[PDB]
Design a protein around this ligand. Sequence first.
Ligand SMILES: O=Nc1c(NC[C@H](O)[C@H](O)[C@H](O)CO)[nH]c(=O)[nH]c1=O
Ligand SMILES: O=Nc1c(NC[C@H](O)[C@H](O)[C@H](O)CO)[nH]c(=O)[nH]c1=O
Ligand SMILES: O=Nc1c(NC[C@H](O)[C@H](O)[C@H](O)CO)[nH]c(=O)[nH]c1=O
Ligand SMILES: O=Nc1c(NC[C@H](O)[C@H](O)[C@H](O)CO)[nH]c(=O)[nH]c1=O
Ligand SMILES: O=Nc1c(NC[C@H](O)[C@H](O)[C@H](O)CO)[nH]c(=O)[nH]c1=O
Lengths: 165, 165, 165, 165, 165
Amino acid sequence: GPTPQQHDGSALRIGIVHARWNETIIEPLLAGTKAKLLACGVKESNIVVQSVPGSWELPIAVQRLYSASQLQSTGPFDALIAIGVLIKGETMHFEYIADSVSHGLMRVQLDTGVPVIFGVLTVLTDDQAKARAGVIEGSHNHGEDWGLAAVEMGVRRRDWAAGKT
Amino acid sequence: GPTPQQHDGSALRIGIVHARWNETIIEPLLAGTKAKLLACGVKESNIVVQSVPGSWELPIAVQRLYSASQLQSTGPFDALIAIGVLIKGETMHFEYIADSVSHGLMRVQLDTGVPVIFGVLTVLTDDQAKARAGVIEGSHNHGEDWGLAAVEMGVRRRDWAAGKT
Amino acid sequence: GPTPQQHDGSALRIGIVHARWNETIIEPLLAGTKAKLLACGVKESNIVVQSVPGSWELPIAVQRLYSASQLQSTGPFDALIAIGVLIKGETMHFEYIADSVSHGLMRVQLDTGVPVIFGVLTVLTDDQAKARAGVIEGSHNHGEDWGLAAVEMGVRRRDWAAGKT
Amino acid sequence: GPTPQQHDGSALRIGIVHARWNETIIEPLLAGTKAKLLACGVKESNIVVQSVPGSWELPIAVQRLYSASQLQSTGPFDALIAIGVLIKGETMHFEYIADSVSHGLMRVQLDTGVPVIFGVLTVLTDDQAKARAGVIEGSHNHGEDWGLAAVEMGVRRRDWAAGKT
Amino acid sequence: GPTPQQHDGSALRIGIVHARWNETIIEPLLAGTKAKLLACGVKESNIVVQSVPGSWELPIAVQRLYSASQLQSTGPFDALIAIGVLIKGETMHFEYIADSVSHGLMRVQLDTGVPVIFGVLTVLTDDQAKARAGVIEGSHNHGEDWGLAAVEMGVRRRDWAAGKT
Ligand SMILES: O=Nc1c(NC[C@H](O)[C@H](O)[C@H](O)CO)[nH]c(=O)[nH]c1=O
Ligand SMILES: O=Nc1c(NC[C@H](O)[C@H](O)[C@H](O)CO)[nH]c(=O)[nH]c1=O
Ligand SMILES: O=Nc1c(NC[C@H](O)[C@H](O)[C@H](O)CO)[nH]c(=O)[nH]c1=O
Ligand SMILES: O=Nc1c(NC[C@H](O)[C@H](O)[C@H](O)CO)[nH]c(=O)[nH]c1=O
Ligand SMILES: O=Nc1c(NC[C@H](O)[C@H](O)[C@H](O)CO)[nH]c(=O)[nH]c1=O
């Protein structure tokens, strides 16, 4: 378990990209993460949320979303969140996508210099996904953690960008 | 399971590179993906389709195909699709190629800033390949998913390129 | 087991970023690493210590922390330390994060040309974490090793930067 | 199994780098790949063949070989082939080298924009190597596949370089 | 088993970086590699040897060592050797470090365009390390192989740098 921390992040602009596989799990997740964002003061209008078919699209989509925000409510995002739900199938498809999407996101992060919250679940059974999405009774929705983290990192990124230590 | 979406993508130019190992599986896949492309309004003439011997050639081939479209019916592709079929052999050849082709494609994607649909199957038995290719009675051809995704991502890439969020 | 070596590093400026998951393990670790830093003559004021929620944030945070020190007590850090504690859960989350955070740090290191001490534990049970953190009576705290290493590498980085061999 | 295709590639210049571990397997392989090259019209003088001690040297060697051809019978190679034979030992040495050599080659390929045929065997037993090298009576020599692929890709690379689609 | 080859490499300048974990294994290794270097005509004064605490430091240290030699007995090294000894512990620490150090070295190699001999042992038991270090009676020291390879690659690098094929 982690240690909770709520930051201002009211001057933050967050970008979220979620995949659409396993939507019944994606929604609960997205809901929780968006919730905590507002809960932290992020303005509803400063939260961009786009989707893609699968997790594989996550990294490319996040890279481009940010890319767009730069060409420009307005202003390059201060933090990004990638939400996806991978579940083991009968083949190794699961593992090859999980590993690449993982490194992919880690890259976009370091490449871009902008925090990309890892909101991707790499589960083995449906129930595990549900449990991590808060779907099950008294189960902790990790989305909340991700929104919370997005804000913290967004704030931190700014300070670093300001040369503050 | 995912949640498809049909987008316009009639102003899209899609590039497809498929390997030739396990052609009886490649064809059904390619067929389905090309089908859904047209089904989305992609003009037959705006769908380029080239092949390579194995999956290892997929990433290099995709990188160069796009590269070519840039030097130029005409205009850099808006989305790319890599189709390959890896099946476990007796050695670790399967895993070393799958992992590299996977990262390879993920890279070309991020490098190029152009979505590259992951149409590569990493299966353990022939039947699994067939099932994923729609070959087996009342099975689902994933190719359809890939064509569908190619369009969506192509459209999305354009908007991002336009700084739209 | 390694061979101990204490260097001057009194003219060193060290940056430390630690995650907050498993704080009861993080603290003992951080404590030991900071201890050995001072023990080597690093001035208390030349030791910057910031935190992040999870290990995933480690690489991005380290990259940016250093980045900031460059824009500028003052002067780009001579060495960095990433402290995190991953513990196997019920899913593959553990492994996908460990592998990416690992490569992520290795990258920031080579990218930046600045040593980033790998103070991340990839454990299977709570006790293992405690044992590596010196928590368990008469056990060895690896944090000490990391602080010690941070100094050595910091010193070495400088010489290399000076073209000395 | 793949689908055979013989291309011209008489105007091609191919570079081959093979390791020397397990030479009794390397030779049969190299022989077959060189054979099919000529068989496709590649001029004997346009086939450069150098060696290195182990597979680890493969990627660096291929990168530099091509690099050299650029500084310049003459003309940067149109395709490269890396031949190596890894066999599981008692330790994890096998896997750590196979994975790095694999990504290494995939990188040189994408980096360089030149196809690098993956002629590396990642086997578990001597016999498997022999079988893949055509050594074991009636077994298939994969080298033939690699030479064949080198030509196709070489030809294709040229067209892409010409902006042809 | 590999095929032996002794080259001149008397005009070579070799840089060696070894970790200090498991020194009783590192020393025998380093000894053997340095031995074969001299045995090949490398001048004692042209062999630089620095150390680092663990294997994780290997890639960064090698990258910087070379880096230094460039700013400049004198002259950028023609080949580099990384010596480290990883042994499975109770946790996954072993695997996460081995995989990153491996890719790290492979990268410095391709990045730098200078061969970096992989003198890192990824063993499961102390005895395996000893056996690979020639320690056990009548056991073959791999260090000899590495020194030998360093020379060959150094010589080859030069020729490639000279555009020779
Ligand atoms: O297939 N299983 C999954 C999946 N599809 C793979 C991929 O994201 C993509 O849609 C196409 O491969 C090519 O772009 N995506 C997930 O988020 N979870 C899964 O469990
Ligand atoms: O070997 N099995 C397979 C394969 N060949 C490997 C590779 O693509 C290539 O042709 C050469 O290795 C070197 O370029 N390619 C596949 O698409 N599926 C397989 O199941
Ligand atoms: O989940 N378990 C762990 C964890 N959280 C994962 C991650 O670091 C992050 O906080 C979010 O995934 C997205 O940024 N972080 C750890 O350091 N150890 C764990 O054992
Ligand atoms: O060790 N076994 C093998 C090997 N040597 C490892 C490596 O390529 C290298 O020579 C040195 O590690 C450092 O450069 N190389 C192979 O192609 N196959 C093997 O089965
Ligand atoms: O821990 N075991 C080992 C080790 N230490 C890990 C690492 O190299 C480093 O010193 C610190 O983690 C952070 O920089 N280094 C080795 O070469 N072999 C081991 O068997």
